[PDB]
């Protein structure tokens, strides 16, 4: 996250970290509950070599140094990456993971209500870079950001399509922003009062640059899809 500041316990409760442990273990991506068993995260997250039985998966956590052996962690039990997602391209950039166990909802970890509207006061969060070329930030980072209509986020990125299935968000001068490592984690909107998942983190161009928003996937887009396969 660019522009933003430390969040405090409990304040994005279905905010997760998804890690790989080889030899060493480190953050990857974020992704976001959505329910006992099932977590909400970016396709291109699982670019890399398909390993079998590296990811770990910690939730009602704030700061990664936090984390030790004794920390406990979800594992993964099957990934669903979207049919039609292809690898450096930013259609249906959208995966779900069941977990092998369903987690509890306690104070420090809840689920986020999907969606079924104009918002305002959305927020992204995550432990990705503080500036472009940067590093994975210790706590996890929030900033307020402004939605901007699809003909406006289409206007600044003439060089691609961008679909229905995605919303933007960003301020015209730049600053604010999600970067690499915050992939995969939530953007949320208040509406009656309540937390909705409008979008899953996935690209800019560079990060927090004036007139360039960042590109999410539409969650209210994929709820067919998400209901499909979690049933
Ligand atoms: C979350 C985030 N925010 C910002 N501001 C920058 C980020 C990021 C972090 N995002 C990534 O690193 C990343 C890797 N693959 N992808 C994203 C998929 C992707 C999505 C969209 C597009 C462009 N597009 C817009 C509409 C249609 N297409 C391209 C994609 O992949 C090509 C390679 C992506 C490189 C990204 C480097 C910078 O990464």
């Not at 950039?93 to 987690?103: E, F, G, N, S, T």
């Not at 360039?212 to 209210?220: E, F, H, L, R, S």
Request: aromatic share 10%; hydrophobic share 35%.
């Amino acid at each position: 996250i660019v522009g933003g500041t430390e969040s405090s316990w409990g304040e994005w409760p279905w905010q997760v970290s998804l890690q790989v442990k080889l030899t060493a273990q480190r953050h990857l991506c974020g992704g976001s509950l959505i329910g006992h068993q099932w977590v909400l995260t970016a396709a291109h997250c699982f670019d890399g070599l398909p390993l079998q039985d590296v990811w770990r998966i910690y939730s009602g956590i704030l700061e990664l140094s936090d984390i030790t052996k004794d920390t406990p962690f979800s594992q993964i039990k099957e990934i669903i990456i979207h049919q039609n997602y292809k690898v450096s391209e930013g259609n249906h950039d959208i995966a779900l993971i069941k977990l092998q166990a369903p987690l509890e909802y306690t104070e420090f970890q809840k689920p986020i209500s999907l969606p079924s509207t104009i918002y305002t006061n959305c927020w992204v969060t995550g432990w990705g870079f503080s500036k472009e070329k940067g590093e994975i930030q210790n706590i996890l980072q929030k900033v307020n950001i402004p939605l901007v209509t699809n003909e406006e986020c289409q206007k600044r990125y003439q060089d691609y399509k961008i679909t229905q299935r995605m919303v933007c968000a960003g301020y015209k001068e730049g600053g604010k922003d999600a970067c690499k490592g915050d992939s995969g984690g939530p953007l949320v909107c208040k509406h009656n009062g309540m937390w909705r998942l409008v979008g899953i983190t996935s690209w800019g161009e560079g990060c927090a640059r004036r007139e360039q928003p960042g590109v999410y996937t539409k969650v209210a887009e994929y709820m067919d899809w998400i209901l499909e396969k979690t049933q």
